[PDB]
């Protein structure tokens, strides 16, 4: 099936508590496989997956070096952006960066991504053509012109189309037993009288894919939360009560070819 | 694998 590799970077200063905190994590689809934290003692890229620990030392060295370069880049960026938005010094501010790629069932290049946010808001993003940028506000337009003259998209393009997919492929080939799991989820439902009115909920659990919850006529508005992880590798989620006593159907997943 | 070439400052 389709797959994706994502890196998430976060940098946040403090009012007067030294250097900024820096966090980086790597995900294959929905499985975290690497981590980095500036406040961590190792000061190195650590494994977060089973089949990722078989990589050689030169790999772990390279990644530790590069992620540290990202930190230094963000270290600089934080100073810059505080000026762009004319923000105070004692204020704590956040920089988020994410990039990655997608592939098809044939494991060939599909999509590439690269995005950037300051204080939770979009700052700039590489367009789908991977040849142009989208500035959020006029401040970001400065950065745009800079990277256009700097041919940044050209560099990032080479990475996403090439390196990113190649190693994503390498990753799948090694974590096959663990990563390509679409084992069927668990369902079941609860029920509890509230007298004339009784509680009813729809539960879904134990599903490795994260993507996912009603008919009497399907209606919106009323219906409501986000998917939750289990911590082991699976996920779970639930979704309405109506004043009745004599009950109705709940509603499709990838690991299943449902109503009960 | 991380970006070895492409990371620039804003």
């Amino acid at each position: 099936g389709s797959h994706s590799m994502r890196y998430f970077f976060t940098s946040v200063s403090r009012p007067g508590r030294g250097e900024p905190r820096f966090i980086a994590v790597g995900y294959v689809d929905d499985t975290q496989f690497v981590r980095f934290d500036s406040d961590a003692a190792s000061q190195r890229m650590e494994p977060r997956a089973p089949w990722i620990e078989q990589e050689g030392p030169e790999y772990w060295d390279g990644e530790t070096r590069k992620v540290k370069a990202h930190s230094q880049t963000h270290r600089v960026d934080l100073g810059t952006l505080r000026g762009y938005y004319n923000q105070s010094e004692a204020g704590s501010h956040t920089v988020q960066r994410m990039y990655g790629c997608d592939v098809g069932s044939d494991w060939r290049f599909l999509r590439g991504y690269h995005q950037y946010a300051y204080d939770g808001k979009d700052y700039i993003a590489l367009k789908e053509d991977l040849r142009s940028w989208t500035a959020a506000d006029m401040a970001a337009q400065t950065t745009k012109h800079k990277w256009e003259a700097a041919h940044v998209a050209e560099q990032l393009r080479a990475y996403l189309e090439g390196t990113c997919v190649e190693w994503l492929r390498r990753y799948l080939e090694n974590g096959k037993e663990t990563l390509q799991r679409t084992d069927a989820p668990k369902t079941h439902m609860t029920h509890h009288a509230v007298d004339h009115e009784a509680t009813l909920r729809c539960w879904a659990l134990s599903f490795y894919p994260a993507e996912i919850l009603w008919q009497r006529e399907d209606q919106t508005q009323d219906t409501e939360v986000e998917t939750r992880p289990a911590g082991d590798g699976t996920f779970q989620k639930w979704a309405v009560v109506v004043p009745s006593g004599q009950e109705y159907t709940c509603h499709q997943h990838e690991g299943l070819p449902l109503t009960l | 694998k991380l970006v070895a070439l492409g990371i620039n400052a804003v």
Partner: T-cell receptor
Amino acid sequence: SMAQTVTQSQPEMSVQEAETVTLSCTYDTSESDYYLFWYKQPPSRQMILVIRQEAYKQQNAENRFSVNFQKAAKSFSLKISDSQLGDAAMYFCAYGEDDKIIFGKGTRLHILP
Amino acid sequence: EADIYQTPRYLVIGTGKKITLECSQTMGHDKMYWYQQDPGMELHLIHYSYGVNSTEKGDLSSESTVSRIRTEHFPLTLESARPSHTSQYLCASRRGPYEQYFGPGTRLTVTE
């Protein structure tokens, strides 16, 4: 600190004026994305870019200065046709990423008039 | 036109003294590097900066120190001169991953 990336085997080299000479350079990296450079440093000790090869830029792309880029073999020699006396200098093969550029020990070229 | 400058080109100084080499740049480059060149002409990265408020170690010793508060300036300091500091010191600037542009250089000799 000095990592073992670039290798320029011959530190000194000699060629008759005019004619052609080739400066070998191999490297060992774990990355797929990187730039390659050749630098010239005359007696004036001024470093001068000779050529930039982008690894993802398909194959080579100047004058008497040619290059043989073998991505699979990780070889990156510098060919200089019709060696002028003015070309006599130190020549450095270089490996570059976002963080920095890593230079080889360099080769000294002597042009014989 | 934009270029890169650093002074002096030459300098002799007594041992056990503080040194300061200024490196100027007008190409608007965010990245800057300092290299020492041996009498063997081998290049050793001393320090570098991704931009303002960024400083990165090449010297594992504390003999050298830098500080980048302006984009156009990247001075290099040596608190106490040593004979082994006798060498050539080259500054460079860099757009992105592209080639870096070197200055004229600074020739140093530390004498007892």
